[PDB]
Design an enzyme around this catalytic site. Structure first.
Site, PDB file in Angstrom:
ATOM      1  N   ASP A   7      55.916  99.242  52.844  1.00 16.23           N
ATOM      2  CA  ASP A   7      56.078  98.493  54.104  1.00 16.23           C
ATOM      3  C   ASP A   7      54.802  97.803  54.662  1.00 16.23           C
ATOM      4  OD1 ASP A   7      57.974  97.651  56.084  1.00 16.23           O
ATOM      5  OD2 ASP A   7      57.736  99.476  57.261  1.00 16.23           O
ATOM      6  N   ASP A  44      52.204 103.588  59.350  1.00 16.59           N
ATOM      7  CA  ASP A  44      53.650 103.528  59.079  1.00 16.59           C
ATOM      8  C   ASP A  44      53.896 103.844  57.610  1.00 16.59           C
ATOM      9  OD1 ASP A  44      56.474 103.347  59.170  1.00 16.59           O
ATOM     10  OD2 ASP A  44      56.507 101.201  59.561  1.00 16.59           O
ATOM     11  N   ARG A  99      52.667  93.847  61.511  1.00 13.97           N
ATOM     12  CA  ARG A  99      53.190  94.826  62.487  1.00 13.97           C
ATOM     13  C   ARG A  99      52.801  96.299  62.216  1.00 13.97           C
ATOM     14  NH1 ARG A  99      57.358  93.523  59.009  1.00 13.97           N
ATOM     15  NH2 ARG A  99      58.227  95.449  58.084  1.00 13.97           N
ATOM     16  N   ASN A 100      52.560  96.638  60.942  1.00  9.54           N
ATOM     17  CA  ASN A 100      52.171  97.989  60.496  1.00  9.54           C
ATOM     18  C   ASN A 100      50.670  98.206  60.237  1.00  9.54           C
ATOM     19  OD1 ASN A 100      54.902  98.774  60.603  1.00  9.54           O
ATOM     20  ND2 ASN A 100      55.267  98.107  58.496  1.00  9.54           N
ATOM     21  N   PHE A 153      60.965 102.018  63.795  1.00  7.16           N
ATOM     22  CA  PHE A 153      59.863 102.925  63.407  1.00  7.16           C
ATOM     23  C   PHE A 153      59.833 104.271  64.167  1.00  7.16           C
ATOM     24  CE2 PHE A 153      57.810 100.151  66.630  1.00  7.16           C
ATOM     25  CZ  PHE A 153      57.151 101.077  67.434  1.00  7.16           C
TER      26      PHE A 153
HETATM   27  C1  LIG Z   1      52.139 108.845  61.973  1.00  8.67           C
HETATM   28  C2  LIG Z   1      52.132 107.379  62.310  1.00  8.67           C
HETATM   29  C3  LIG Z   1      51.691 106.803  63.495  1.00  8.67           C
HETATM   30  C4  LIG Z   1      51.842 105.448  63.354  1.00  8.67           C
HETATM   31  N1  LIG Z   1      51.635 104.415  64.242  1.00  8.67           N
HETATM   32  C5  LIG Z   1      50.706 104.414  65.217  1.00  8.67           C
HETATM   33  O1  LIG Z   1      49.939 105.353  65.387  1.00  8.67           O
HETATM   34  C6  LIG Z   1      50.646 103.319  66.189  1.00  8.67           C
HETATM   35  C7  LIG Z   1      51.640 102.409  66.449  1.00  8.67           C
HETATM   36  N2  LIG Z   1      51.274 101.617  67.463  1.00  8.67           N
HETATM   37  C8  LIG Z   1      52.045 100.503  67.998  1.00  8.67           C
HETATM   38  C9  LIG Z   1      51.534  99.125  67.571  1.00  8.67           C
HETATM   39  C10 LIG Z   1      53.543 100.672  68.254  1.00  8.67           C
HETATM   40  C11 LIG Z   1      52.560 100.697  69.422  1.00  8.67           C
HETATM   41  C12 LIG Z   1      50.056 101.977  67.950  1.00  8.67           C
HETATM   42  N3  LIG Z   1      49.296 101.501  68.947  1.00  8.67           N
HETATM   43  C13 LIG Z   1      48.130 102.059  69.231  1.00  8.67           C
HETATM   44  N4  LIG Z   1      47.637 103.082  68.536  1.00  8.67           N
HETATM   45  C14 LIG Z   1      48.326 103.625  67.513  1.00  8.67           C
HETATM   46  N5  LIG Z   1      47.761 104.670  66.808  1.00  8.67           N
HETATM   47  C15 LIG Z   1      49.590 103.074  67.186  1.00  8.67           C
HETATM   48  N6  LIG Z   1      52.412 105.205  62.187  1.00  8.67           N
HETATM   49  N7  LIG Z   1      52.555 106.420  61.534  1.00  8.67           N
END
Ligand SMILES: Cc1cc(NC(=O)c2cn(C3(C)CC3)c3ncnc(N)c23)n[nH]1
Ligand SMILES: Cc1cc(NC(=O)c2cn(C3(C)CC3)c3ncnc(N)c23)n[nH]1
Lengths: 274, 287
Positions: free
Chosen positions: A146, A164, A150-151, A33
């Site tokens: 997706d 995600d 996990r997402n 990711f």
């Molecule tokens: C643009 C975008 C950001 C995102 N993903 C997350 O912002 C986040 C992922 N995680 C994981 C579980 C990996 C650590 C987070 N943990 C705490 N706050 C978070 N906002 C996240 N996807 N697309």
């Protein structure tokens, strides 16, 4: 090419956050990711003082596909606003690596949150919140592709946030086989009804407290098992009504699966009837 | 479909510790009983799908299997067999005792006797030999109309006798029809190893492998350095288009740097072919 056009246009007011006002902190997660870090943001979208945020960036040795995905997330997240979709606050495109600034989810991923663990009412509430987010995205003509535990992120107040968006599309394959719809596996077709299939798998993950789907079956054997009509059995601590909802999400014919409004309604009916 | 030249009994393969895990898949150390005429057990490596594998990862592992059945060279990883029926796809290959070339060279910075300017003692002569072995492998792959696409120090293995083995064919493509492979969608090769025409135009040829080989040369002479250090990958579009290339590193002759620069010429037809790269490295050794 398409990416070089996108990068240059991206590099060049509503979204650009001054890099000097972002203080990057500890790593929250790393993988395919990318990389997500905790941070503080001074004067973020007109807010006083420091706002605690998460920041998504490319992992080391990023490919064109990973850069394209991150730019795609920015493009999507600019256009969406919902309490159960992760909120974009801005981006840093002018100083060092590309950074996307989003709301911080203090309990991390739903998979992680469930695995460390709640009543069945809470688990039904988590499913409902995600279904509400998905109903909204479906109405905006976005296929997420997706959907998985996990997402989904778990924010303050145990609030679900869909994240995600790197594989999302407006309406080769990098979605894990075990979350994919039958038509996605065999015909490479992705719709809101294939998101519903993935939601069924996510529902199974919720009731099993972050279980691993199809445990012991390798994905190379799952292709034939799904075509012949085999599905995961009713797991431990799952009602007949909840399992009936899962099985409908995994119908072979996409038109026989529920829409997200039907999923949301089912979960609303469940919670009042408790 | 099962090929009896390659199919191996599952009961005869025992899997051990993970050697490496990432985008490429999962590689484990293993042992194989009664492999390819050898009585008893043989220590091997096994490539398999990682947890939560996607269709692209399965197609890539299948494609590697198909490639490695057809290609044979002393500097290409040797396929011994596969377990493909009634279970996970396991590809059985030669074990490389020193691991990746990147890892082996990075160890040489801290493990004596180290780099000197027996098999843990390294000279510039040795580094030139490693580059030559890889170029010999690539020359053969080019004759086979295969573009590797992912040539990098992380994907060269160092086997018994410090012999180089090209590995990780998951992104490799046949070019027999037009001498090029073109993909409409974005590639999965790290940006910092990609030829300019691959990055901009999505064109992959043996001459784009030559570009990648130049980056590999830079990795070798820096003892596993990180290309374009501190430069974000999105900046490579502008950097390369305006004619910027990596500077001559410490531990690099004028002749070696000229070869790297030749591999990074904007026009693919101005880059050397692998036969000439091999010749250039031979001339460096002898002198
Ligand atoms: C643009 C975008 C950001 C995102 N993903 C997350 O912002 C986040 C992922 N995680 C994981 C579980 C990996 C650590 C987070 N943990 C705490 N706050 C978070 N906002 C996240 N996807 N697309
Ligand atoms: C079919 C195939 C296998 C392969 N790769 C490796 O076999 C190997 C990878 N590694 C790394 C550096 C990751 C751990 C190895 N280490 C010691 N021996 C090895 N044969 C390997 N590519 N394609």
């Amino acid at each position: 090419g398409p990416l070089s056009l996108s990068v240059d246009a991206f590099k060049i007011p509503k979204w650009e956050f001054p890099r000097k006002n972002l203080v990057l902190g500890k790593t929250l997660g790393e993988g395919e990711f990318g990389k997500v870090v905790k941070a503080t943001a001074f004067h973020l979208k007109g807010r006083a003082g420091y706002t605690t945020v998460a920041v998504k960036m490319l992992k080391e040795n990023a490919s064109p596909s990973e850069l394209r995905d991150l730019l795609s997330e920015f493009n999507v997240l600019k256009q969406v606003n919902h309490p159960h979709v992760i909120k974009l606050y801005g981006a840093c495109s002018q100083d060092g690596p590309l950074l996307l600034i989003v709301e911080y989810a203090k309990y991390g991923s739903l998979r992680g949150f469930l695995r460390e663990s709640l009543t069945m009412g809470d688990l039904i509430s988590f499913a409902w919140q995600i279904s509400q987010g998905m109903q909204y995205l479906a109405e905006m003509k976005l296929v997420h592709r997706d959907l998985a535990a996990r997402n989904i992120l778990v924010a303050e107040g145990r609030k679900m946030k869909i994240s995600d968006f790197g594989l999302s599309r407006d309406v080769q394959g990098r979605i894990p086989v075990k979350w994919m719809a039958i038509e996605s596996l065999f015909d490479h077709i992705y719709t809101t009804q294939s998101d519903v299939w993935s939601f069924g798998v996510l529902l199974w993950e919720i009731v099993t407290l972050g279980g691993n789907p199809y445990p012991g079956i390798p994905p190379e054997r799952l292709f034939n098992l799904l075509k012949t009509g085999h599905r995961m059995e009713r797991p431990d601590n799952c009602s007949e009504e909840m399992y009936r909802l899962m099985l409908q999400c995994w119908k072979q014919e996409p038109d026989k699966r529920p829409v997200f409004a039907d999923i949301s309604k089912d979960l609303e009916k469940m919670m009042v009837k408790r």
